[PDB]
Coordinates of C-alpha atoms and ligand atoms in Angstrom, one line a residue:
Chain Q
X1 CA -9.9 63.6 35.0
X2 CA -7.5 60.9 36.9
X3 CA -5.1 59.2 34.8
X4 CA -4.0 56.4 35.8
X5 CA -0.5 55.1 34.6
X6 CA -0.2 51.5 35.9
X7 CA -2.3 48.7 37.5
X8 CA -1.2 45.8 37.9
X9 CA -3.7 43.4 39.0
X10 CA -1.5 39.9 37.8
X11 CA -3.6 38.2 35.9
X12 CA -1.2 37.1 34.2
X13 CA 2.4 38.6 34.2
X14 CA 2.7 39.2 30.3
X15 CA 3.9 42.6 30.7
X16 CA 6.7 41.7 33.0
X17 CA 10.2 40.6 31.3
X18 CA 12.7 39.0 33.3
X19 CA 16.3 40.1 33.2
X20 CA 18.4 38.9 30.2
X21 CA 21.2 41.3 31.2
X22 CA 21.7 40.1 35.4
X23 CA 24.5 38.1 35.7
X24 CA 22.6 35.9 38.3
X25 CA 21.4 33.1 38.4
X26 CA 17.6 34.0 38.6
X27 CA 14.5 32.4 39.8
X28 CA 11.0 31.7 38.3
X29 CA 8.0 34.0 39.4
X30 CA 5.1 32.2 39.2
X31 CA 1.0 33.7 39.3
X32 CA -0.3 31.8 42.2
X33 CA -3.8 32.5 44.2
X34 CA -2.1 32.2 47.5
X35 CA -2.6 30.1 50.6
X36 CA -5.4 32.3 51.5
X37 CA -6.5 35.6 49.8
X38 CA -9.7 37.6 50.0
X39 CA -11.1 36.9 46.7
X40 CA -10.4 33.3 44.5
X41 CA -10.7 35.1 41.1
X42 CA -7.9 37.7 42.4
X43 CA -4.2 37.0 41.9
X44 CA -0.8 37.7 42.5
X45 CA 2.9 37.4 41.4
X46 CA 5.1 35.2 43.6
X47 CA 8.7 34.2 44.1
X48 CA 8.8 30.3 43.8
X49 CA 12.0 29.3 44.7
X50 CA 14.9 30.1 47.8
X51 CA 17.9 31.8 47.5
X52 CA 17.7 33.3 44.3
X53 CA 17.1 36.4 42.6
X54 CA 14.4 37.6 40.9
X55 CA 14.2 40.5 38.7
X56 CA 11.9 41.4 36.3
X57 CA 10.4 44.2 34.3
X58 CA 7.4 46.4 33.3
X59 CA 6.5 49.4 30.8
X60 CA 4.0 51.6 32.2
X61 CA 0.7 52.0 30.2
X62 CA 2.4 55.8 29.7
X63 CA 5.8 57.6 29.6
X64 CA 5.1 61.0 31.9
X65 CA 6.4 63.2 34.3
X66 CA 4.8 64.0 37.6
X67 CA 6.1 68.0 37.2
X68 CA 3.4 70.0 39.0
X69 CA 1.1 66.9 39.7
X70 CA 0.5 64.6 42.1
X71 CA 1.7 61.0 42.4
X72 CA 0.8 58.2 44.4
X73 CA 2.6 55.0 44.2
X74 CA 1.0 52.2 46.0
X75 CA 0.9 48.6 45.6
X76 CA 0.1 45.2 48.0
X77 CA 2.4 42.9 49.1
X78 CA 2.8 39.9 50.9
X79 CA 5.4 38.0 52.6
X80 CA 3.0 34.6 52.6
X81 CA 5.9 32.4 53.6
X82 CA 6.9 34.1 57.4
X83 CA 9.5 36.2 55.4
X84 CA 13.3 35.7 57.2
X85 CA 15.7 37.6 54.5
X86 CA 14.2 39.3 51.3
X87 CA 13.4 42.5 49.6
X88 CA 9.4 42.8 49.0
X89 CA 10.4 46.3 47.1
X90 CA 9.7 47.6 43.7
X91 CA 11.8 50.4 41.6
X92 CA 10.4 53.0 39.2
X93 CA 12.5 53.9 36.3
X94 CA 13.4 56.5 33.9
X95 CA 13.1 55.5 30.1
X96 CA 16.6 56.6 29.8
X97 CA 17.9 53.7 32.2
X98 CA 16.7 51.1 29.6
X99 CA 16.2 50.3 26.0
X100 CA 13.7 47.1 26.5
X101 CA 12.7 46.0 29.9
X102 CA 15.3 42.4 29.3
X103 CA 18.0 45.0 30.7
X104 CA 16.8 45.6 33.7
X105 CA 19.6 45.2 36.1
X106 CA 20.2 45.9 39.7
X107 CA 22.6 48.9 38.7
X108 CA 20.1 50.0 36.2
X109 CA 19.5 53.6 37.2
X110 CA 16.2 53.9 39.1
X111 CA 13.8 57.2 40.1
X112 CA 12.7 56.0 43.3
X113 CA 12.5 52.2 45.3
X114 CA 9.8 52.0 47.8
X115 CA 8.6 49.1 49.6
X116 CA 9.4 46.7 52.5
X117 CA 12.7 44.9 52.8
X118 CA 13.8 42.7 55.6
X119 CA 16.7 40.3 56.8
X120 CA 17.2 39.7 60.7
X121 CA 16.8 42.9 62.6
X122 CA 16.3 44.9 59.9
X123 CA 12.6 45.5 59.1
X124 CA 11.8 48.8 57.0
X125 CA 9.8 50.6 54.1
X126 CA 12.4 51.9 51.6
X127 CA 12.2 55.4 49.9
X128 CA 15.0 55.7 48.1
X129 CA 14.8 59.2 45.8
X130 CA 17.3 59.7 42.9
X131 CA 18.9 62.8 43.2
X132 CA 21.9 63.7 40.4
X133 CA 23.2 60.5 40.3
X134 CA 23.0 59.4 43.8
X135 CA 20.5 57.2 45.2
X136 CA 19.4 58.5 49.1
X137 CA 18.2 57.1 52.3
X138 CA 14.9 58.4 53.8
X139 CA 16.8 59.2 56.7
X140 CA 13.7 58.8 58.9
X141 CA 13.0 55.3 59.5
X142 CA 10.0 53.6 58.5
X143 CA 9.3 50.2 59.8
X144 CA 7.6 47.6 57.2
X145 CA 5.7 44.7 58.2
X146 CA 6.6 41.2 58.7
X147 CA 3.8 38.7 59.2
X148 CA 2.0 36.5 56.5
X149 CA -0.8 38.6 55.6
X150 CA -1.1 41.2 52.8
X151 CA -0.3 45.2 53.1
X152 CA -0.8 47.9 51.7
X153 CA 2.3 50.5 50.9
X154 CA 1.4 53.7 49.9
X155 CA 3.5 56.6 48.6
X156 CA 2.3 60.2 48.0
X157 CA 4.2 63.2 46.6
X158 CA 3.0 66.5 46.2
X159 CA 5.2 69.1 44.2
X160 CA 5.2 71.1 47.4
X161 CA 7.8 69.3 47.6
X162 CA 6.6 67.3 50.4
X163 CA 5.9 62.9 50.7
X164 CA 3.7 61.2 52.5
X165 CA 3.9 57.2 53.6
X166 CA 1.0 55.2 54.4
X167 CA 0.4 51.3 55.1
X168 CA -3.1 50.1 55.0
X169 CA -4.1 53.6 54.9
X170 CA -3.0 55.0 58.1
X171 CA 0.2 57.7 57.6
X172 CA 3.2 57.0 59.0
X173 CA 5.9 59.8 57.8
X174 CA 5.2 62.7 56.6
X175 CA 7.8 65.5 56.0
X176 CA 9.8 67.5 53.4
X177 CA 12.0 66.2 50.8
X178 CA 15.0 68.6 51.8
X179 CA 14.3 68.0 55.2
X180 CA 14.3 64.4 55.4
X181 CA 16.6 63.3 53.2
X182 CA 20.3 64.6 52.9
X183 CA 19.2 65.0 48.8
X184 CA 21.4 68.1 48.7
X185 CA 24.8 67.1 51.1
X186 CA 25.8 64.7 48.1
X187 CA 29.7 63.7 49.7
X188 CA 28.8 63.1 53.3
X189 CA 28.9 59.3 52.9
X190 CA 31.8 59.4 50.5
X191 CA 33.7 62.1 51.5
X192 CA 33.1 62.8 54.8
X193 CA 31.1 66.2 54.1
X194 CA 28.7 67.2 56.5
X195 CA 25.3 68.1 55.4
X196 CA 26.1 71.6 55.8
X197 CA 28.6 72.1 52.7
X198 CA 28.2 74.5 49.9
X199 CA 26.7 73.2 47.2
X200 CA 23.5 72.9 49.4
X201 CA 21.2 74.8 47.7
X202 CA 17.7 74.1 48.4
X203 CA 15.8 72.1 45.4
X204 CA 11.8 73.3 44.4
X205 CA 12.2 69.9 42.3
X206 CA 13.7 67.0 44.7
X207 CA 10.1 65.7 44.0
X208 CA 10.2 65.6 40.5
X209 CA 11.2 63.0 37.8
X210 CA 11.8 64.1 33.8
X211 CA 10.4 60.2 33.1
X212 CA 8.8 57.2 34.5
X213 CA 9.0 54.6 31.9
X214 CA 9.5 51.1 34.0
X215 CA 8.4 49.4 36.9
X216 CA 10.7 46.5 38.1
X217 CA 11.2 44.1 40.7
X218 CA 15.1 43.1 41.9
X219 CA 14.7 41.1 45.5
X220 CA 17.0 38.4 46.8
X221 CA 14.9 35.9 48.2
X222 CA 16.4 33.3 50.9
X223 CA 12.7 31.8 51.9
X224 CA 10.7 32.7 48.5
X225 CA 6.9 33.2 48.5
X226 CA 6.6 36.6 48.7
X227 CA 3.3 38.2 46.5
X228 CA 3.2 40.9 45.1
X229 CA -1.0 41.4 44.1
X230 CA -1.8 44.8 43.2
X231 CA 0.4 47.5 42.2
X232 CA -1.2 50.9 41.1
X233 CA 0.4 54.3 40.0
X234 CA -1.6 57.4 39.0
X235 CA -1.9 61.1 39.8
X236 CA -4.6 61.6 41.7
X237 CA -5.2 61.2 44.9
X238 CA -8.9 60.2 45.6
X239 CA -8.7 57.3 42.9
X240 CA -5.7 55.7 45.3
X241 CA -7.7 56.2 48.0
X242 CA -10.1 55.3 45.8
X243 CA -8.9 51.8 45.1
X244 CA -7.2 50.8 48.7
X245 CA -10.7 50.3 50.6
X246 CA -10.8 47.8 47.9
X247 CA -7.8 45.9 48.6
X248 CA -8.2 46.7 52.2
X249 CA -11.0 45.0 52.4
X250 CA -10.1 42.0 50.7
X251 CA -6.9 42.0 52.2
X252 CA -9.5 42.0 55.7
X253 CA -11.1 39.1 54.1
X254 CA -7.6 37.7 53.0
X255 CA -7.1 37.5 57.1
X256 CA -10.1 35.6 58.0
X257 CA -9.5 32.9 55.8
X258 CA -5.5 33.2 57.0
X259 CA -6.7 32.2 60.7
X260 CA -8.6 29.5 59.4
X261 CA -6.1 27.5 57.6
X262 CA -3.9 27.9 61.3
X263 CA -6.4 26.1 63.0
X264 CA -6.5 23.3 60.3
X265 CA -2.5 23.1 61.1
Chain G
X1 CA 38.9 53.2 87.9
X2 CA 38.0 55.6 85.3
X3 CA 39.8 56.4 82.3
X4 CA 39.7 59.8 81.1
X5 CA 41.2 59.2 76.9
X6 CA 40.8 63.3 76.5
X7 CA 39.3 66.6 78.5
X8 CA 40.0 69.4 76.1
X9 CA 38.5 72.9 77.6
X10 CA 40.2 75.4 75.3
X11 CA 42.0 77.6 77.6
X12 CA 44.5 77.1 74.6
X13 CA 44.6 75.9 71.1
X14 CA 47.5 73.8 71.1
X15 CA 47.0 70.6 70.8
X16 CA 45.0 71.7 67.6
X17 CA 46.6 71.7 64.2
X18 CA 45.0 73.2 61.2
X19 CA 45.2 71.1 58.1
X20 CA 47.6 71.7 55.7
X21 CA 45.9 68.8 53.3
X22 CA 42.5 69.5 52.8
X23 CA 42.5 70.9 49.7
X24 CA 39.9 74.0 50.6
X25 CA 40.1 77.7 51.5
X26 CA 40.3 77.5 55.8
X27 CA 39.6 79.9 58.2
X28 CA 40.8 80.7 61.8
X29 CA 39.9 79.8 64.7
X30 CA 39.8 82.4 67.7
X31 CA 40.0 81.3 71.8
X32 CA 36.9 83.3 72.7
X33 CA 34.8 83.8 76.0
X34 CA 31.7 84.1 73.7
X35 CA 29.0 86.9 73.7
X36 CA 27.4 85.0 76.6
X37 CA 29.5 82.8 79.0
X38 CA 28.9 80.9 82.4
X39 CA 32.3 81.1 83.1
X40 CA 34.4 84.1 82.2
X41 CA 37.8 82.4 82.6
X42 CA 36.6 79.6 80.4
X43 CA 36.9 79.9 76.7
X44 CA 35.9 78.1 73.5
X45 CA 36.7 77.5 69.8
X46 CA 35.4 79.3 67.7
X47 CA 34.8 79.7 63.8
X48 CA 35.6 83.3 63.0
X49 CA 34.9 84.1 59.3
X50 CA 32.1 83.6 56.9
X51 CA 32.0 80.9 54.4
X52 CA 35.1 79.4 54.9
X53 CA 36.1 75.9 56.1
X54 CA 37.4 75.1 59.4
X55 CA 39.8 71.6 59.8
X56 CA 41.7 70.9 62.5
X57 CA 42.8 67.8 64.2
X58 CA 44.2 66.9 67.8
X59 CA 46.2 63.8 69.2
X60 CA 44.0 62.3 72.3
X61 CA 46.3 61.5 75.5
X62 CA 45.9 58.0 74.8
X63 CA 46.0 55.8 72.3
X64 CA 42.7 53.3 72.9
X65 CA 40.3 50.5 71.9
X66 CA 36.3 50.0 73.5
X67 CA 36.6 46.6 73.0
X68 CA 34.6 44.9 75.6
X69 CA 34.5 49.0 77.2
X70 CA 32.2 50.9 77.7
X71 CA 32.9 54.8 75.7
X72 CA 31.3 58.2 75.9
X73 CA 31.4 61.0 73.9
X74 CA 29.8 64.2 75.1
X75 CA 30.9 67.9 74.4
X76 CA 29.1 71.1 74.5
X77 CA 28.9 73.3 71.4
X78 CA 27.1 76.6 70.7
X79 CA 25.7 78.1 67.5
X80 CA 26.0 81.5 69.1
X81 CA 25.9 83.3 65.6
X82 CA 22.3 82.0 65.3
X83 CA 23.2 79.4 62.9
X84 CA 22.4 79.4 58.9
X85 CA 24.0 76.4 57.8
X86 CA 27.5 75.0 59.5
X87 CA 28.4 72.1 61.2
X88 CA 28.5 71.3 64.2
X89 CA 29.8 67.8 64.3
X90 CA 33.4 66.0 65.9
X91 CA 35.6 63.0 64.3
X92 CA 37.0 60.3 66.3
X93 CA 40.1 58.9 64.0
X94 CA 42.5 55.7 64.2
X95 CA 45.8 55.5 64.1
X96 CA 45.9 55.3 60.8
X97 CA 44.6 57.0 58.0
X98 CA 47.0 60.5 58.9
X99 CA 51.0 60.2 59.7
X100 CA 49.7 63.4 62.1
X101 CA 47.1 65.7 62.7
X102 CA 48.1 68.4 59.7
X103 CA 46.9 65.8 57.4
X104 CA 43.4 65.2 58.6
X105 CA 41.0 65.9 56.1
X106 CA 37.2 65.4 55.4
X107 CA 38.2 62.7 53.3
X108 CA 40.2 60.8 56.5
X109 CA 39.2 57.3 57.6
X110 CA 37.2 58.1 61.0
X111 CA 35.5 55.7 63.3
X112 CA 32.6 57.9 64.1
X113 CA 31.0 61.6 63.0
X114 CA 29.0 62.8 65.5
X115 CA 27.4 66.2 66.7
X116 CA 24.6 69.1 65.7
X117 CA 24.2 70.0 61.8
X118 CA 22.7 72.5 61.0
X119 CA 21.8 74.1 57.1
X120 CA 18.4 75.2 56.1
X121 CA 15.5 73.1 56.8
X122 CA 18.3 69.8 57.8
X123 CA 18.7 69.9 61.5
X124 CA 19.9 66.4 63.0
X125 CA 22.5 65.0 65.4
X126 CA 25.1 63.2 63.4
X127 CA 25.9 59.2 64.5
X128 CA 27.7 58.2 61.3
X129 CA 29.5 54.8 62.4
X130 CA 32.3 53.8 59.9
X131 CA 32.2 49.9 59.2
X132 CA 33.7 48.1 56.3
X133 CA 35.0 50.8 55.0
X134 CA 32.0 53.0 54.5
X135 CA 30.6 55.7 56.6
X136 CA 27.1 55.0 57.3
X137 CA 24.2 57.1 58.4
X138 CA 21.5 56.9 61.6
X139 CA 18.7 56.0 59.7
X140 CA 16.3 57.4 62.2
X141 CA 16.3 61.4 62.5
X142 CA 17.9 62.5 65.7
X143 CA 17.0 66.4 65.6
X144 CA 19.7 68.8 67.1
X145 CA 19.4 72.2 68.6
X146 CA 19.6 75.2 66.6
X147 CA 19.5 78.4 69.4
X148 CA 22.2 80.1 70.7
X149 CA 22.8 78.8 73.9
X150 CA 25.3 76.1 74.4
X151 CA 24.0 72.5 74.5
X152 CA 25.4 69.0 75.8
X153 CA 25.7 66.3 72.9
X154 CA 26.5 63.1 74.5
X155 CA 26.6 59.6 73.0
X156 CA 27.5 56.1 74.7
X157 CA 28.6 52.8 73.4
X158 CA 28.3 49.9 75.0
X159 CA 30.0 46.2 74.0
X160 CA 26.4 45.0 73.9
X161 CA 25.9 46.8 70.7
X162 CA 24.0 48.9 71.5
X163 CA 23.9 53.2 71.6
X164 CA 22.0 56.1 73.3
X165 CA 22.1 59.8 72.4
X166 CA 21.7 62.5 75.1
X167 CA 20.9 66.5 74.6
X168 CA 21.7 68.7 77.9
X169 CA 21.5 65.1 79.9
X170 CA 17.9 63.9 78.2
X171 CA 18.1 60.9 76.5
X172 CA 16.5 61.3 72.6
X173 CA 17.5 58.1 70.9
X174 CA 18.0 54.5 72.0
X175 CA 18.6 51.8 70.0
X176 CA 20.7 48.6 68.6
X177 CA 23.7 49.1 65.6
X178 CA 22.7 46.1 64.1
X179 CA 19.0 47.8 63.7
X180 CA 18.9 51.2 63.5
X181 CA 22.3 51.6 61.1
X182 CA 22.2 49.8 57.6
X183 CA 25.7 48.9 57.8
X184 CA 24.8 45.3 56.7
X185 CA 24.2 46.0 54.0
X186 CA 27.3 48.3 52.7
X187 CA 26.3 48.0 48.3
X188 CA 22.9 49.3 49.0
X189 CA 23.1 53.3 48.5
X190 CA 25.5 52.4 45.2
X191 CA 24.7 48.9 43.6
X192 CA 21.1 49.9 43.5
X193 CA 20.8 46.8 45.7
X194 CA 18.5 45.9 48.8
X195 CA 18.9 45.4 52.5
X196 CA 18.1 41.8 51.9
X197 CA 21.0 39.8 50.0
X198 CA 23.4 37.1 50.0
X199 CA 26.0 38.5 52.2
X200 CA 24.2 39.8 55.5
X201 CA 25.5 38.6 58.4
X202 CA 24.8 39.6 62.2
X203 CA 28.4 41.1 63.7
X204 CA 28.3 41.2 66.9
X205 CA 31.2 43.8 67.1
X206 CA 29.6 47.0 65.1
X207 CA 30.3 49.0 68.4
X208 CA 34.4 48.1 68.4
X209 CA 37.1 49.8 66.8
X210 CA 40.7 48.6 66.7
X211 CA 42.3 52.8 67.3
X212 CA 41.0 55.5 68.9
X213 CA 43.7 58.1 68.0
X214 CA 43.3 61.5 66.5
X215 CA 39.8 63.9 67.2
X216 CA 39.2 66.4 64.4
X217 CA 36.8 69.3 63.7
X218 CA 36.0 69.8 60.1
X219 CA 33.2 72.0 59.5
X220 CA 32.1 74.0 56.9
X221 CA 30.8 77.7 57.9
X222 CA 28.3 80.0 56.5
X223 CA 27.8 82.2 59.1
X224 CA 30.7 81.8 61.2
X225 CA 30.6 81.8 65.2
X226 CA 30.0 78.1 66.6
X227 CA 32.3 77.4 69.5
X228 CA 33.1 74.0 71.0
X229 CA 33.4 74.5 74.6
X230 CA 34.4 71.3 76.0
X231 CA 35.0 68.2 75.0
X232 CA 35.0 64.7 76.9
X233 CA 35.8 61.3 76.1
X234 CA 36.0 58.4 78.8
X235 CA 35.3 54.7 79.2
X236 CA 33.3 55.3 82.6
X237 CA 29.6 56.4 82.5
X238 CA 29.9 57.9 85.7
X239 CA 32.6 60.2 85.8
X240 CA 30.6 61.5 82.6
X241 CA 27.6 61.7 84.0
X242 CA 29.9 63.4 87.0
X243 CA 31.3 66.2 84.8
X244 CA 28.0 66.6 83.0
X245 CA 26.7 68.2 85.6
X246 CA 29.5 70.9 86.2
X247 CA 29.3 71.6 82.4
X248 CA 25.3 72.2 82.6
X249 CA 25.2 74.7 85.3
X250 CA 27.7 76.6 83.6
X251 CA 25.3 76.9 80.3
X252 CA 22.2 77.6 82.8
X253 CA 24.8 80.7 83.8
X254 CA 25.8 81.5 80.4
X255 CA 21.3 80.8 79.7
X256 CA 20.5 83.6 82.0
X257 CA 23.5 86.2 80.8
X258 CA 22.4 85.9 77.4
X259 CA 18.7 86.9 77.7
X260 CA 19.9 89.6 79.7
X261 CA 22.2 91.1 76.9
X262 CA 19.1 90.8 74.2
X263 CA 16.7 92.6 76.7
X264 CA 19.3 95.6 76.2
X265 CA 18.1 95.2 72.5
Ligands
LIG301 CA1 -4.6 41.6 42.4
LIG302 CA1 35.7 75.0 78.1
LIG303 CL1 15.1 53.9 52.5
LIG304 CL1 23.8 60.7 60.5

C-alpha cells in the first residue's frame, strides 16, 4: 500500500556525499545526539563548524514521480545553537540535475526547497517550486521557527493541484499552486511583466515532477549547530501522519529535558 | 507645507505618451466617463481593445527624492469590464533608465510596481520594490479587488522603513521592508541559494530612492476596459488622507448608478 521513498533517521550519514563540485570552502557535518533530545538511541546530522557551508547529498531509496499521487515531504529540524543567520532547508532533485550526488551544487537544478531559513528579521518556511526553469517564491509567507528545540516541517501536495504546510502538525497555508505562486507570470521579476501576461495559461501539473532522484542539504551557517534528525518522503498521507506523533512526541520529550539543562546553567 | 509631486485626473491625455519602444502590439487608450461614474464631468483612462498591450508613460511635475520623507501613492482604478486577466498596476521611474517617456517600457528600471492584478485564480495588490538592481516581490499575499466598481489603492512609505497598504481607506497590510521583502537576499530566486548567506546585511535605507521621475502604465489586457481615474502622489499623509475622501464619495455615487443600470438588466 504506502511506499515510502526516503527516511532518514541518521544513524549514520553513509548515504550522504558531500560536494566535490562547490567551489567553497565546506564544513564538516558531524552525527551528534544533541544537547538534549527525546530519545538517547535517536540521532541526528549537525553542522559543526561557523561560517561555512555545508552541502551534501542523498539518493532516494527510489527514482519516481508523484503524477497522480500524493506526496508528503516532511522532516525535523533543529536550530540547537539559538540560530542567528542560517538556512535549516533541504532541496529535492531531479535525476537529471546530477550524475552522482559529489555534484551537488547550489546551482544544481532543484524540484522544490522547503524548510526554515533565517538571518536577522527574516524568519520563514521556504517553498520554492520549479516551474520551466525558474525557481518561485510561495508568495504567501510562512513564518519558521526560531528557538532551540526541534520541529516538525511538513509539506503535502495533492494533484488537485493544491499544497498544504504544516509544523508540528497544525496547518498553516493552505491554497492552490496557480493561486499562490506567480508559477505562470515567468518575466515579472525580470522583465517587469505583470502577472497578467499572455503566456498565463493555467497549469493541471504545477504540482507535478517527471523525477525525484536526490535529497540535498546547501545552508550557510554563521553560528553552526543546526540538526537535521528525521527526514521522511512518501506518498501517502496517513503513514506521514503516521510517523510525526512519533517525532512529536519525542520531540515533547526533547523539550523537557531542554528546560532541564537551563536550569543547570 | 505639503507637496503635491503629481494629481493626474484625466480630463486629458496629454501628459501621457504611448511607447514607441516596447517591442509589442499596443492598443489605445480612450478618455471615457465610464458605464457608471460619480462624476459626469470626470473622466478616466481607459484600455479599449481586447488582448493588446497598453504602455504609456508621463513626466511628474517634479523631479523628487523620499529621503528622510514621508511618500504616498494612492489612485483609484476600475475593472469595469468585469476583469479576466489584465493589470491593474502603476510604475514610479527615475530619472534614468528612459531619455523620455516614449521609451518606457516593461523592461525600464522602476523604483516601485504597485496596484490590483488580476488573471485567473492570481488576484493580489502588487508592492514590487526595486533594490540592487532587481525587482522584488511582497512576499505576503495582499489580495486586490476584482468587481466593477472603482476602488482606492493607497500605499505609504515612511523613512522608518517601514510600509502600509490601504483599499478604499482600510488598511490590509502593515509591515517592515527589511521583513516582509526578501531583498536581502537578491541571488536567491536564481543562484538556487538561501535567505541565509555571507552577504546579508540590514540597510536601513530600503524605503529611499535617489529619482522619482517618470509614472507609467504598462498593462497587458484581455478583456479590455480598466480605467485609472485618478492618480495622487504627495509627501504629506494628510492632504492624502484629505483628497481620499473626495475621491470615495465620488465611487459611493458611481456604487449606487451602477446597480441601478444592472437592475435594468
Ligand atoms: Ca532521527
Ligand atoms: Ca479623474
Ligand atoms: Cl519560499
Ligand atoms: Cl508583488
Amino acid at each position: 500500500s504506502a511506499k515510502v521513498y526516503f527516511h532518514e533517521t541518521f544513524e549514520n550519514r553513509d548515504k550522504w556525499i558531500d560536494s566535490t563540485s562547490s567551489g567553497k570552502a565546506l564544513g564538516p557535518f558531524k552525527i551528534v545526539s544533541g544537547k538534549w533530545y527525546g530519545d538517547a538511541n535517536n540521532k541526528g546530522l549537525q553542522t559543526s563548524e561557523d561560517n561555512k557551508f555545508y552541502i551534501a547529498a542523498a539518493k532516494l531509496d527510489e527514482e519516481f514521480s508523484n503524477k497522480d499521487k500524493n506526496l508528503i515531504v516532511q522532516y525535523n529540524l533543529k536550530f540547537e545553537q539559538g540560530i542567528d543567520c542560517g538556512g535549516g532547508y533541504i532541496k529535492l532533485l531531479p535525476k537529471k540535475s546530477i550524475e552522482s550526488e559529489e555534484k551537488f551544487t547550489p546551482e544544481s537544478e532543484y524540484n522544490i526547497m522547503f524548510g526554515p531559513d533565517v538571518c536577522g528579521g527574516s524568519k520563514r518556511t521556504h517553498v520554492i517550486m520549479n516551474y520551466k526553469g525558474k525557481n518561485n517564491l510561495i508568495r504567501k509567507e510562512i513564518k519558521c521557527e526560531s528557538d532551540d528545540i526541534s520541529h516538525l516541517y511538513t509539506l503535502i501536495i495533492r494533484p488537485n493541484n493544491t499544497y498544504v504546510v504544516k509544523i508540528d502538525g497544525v496547518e498553516k497555508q493552505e491554497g492552490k499552486f496557480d493561486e499562490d505562486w506567480d508559477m505562470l507570470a515567468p518575466k515579472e521579476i525580470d522583465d517587469g511583466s505583470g502577472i497578467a501576461n499572455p503566456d498565463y495559461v493555467y497549469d493541471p501539473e504545477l504540482y507535478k515532477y517527471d523525477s525525484f532522484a536526490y535529497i540535498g542539504i546547501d545552508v550557510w551557517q554563521v553560528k553552526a549547530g543546526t540538526i537535521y534528525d528525521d527526514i521522511l518522503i512518501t506518498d501517502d498521507i496517513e503513514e506521514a501522519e503516521k510517523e510525526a506523533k512519533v517525532i512529536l512526541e519525542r520531540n515533547a520529550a526533547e523539550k523537557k529535558m531542554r528546560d532541564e539543562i537551563k536550569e543547570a546553567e
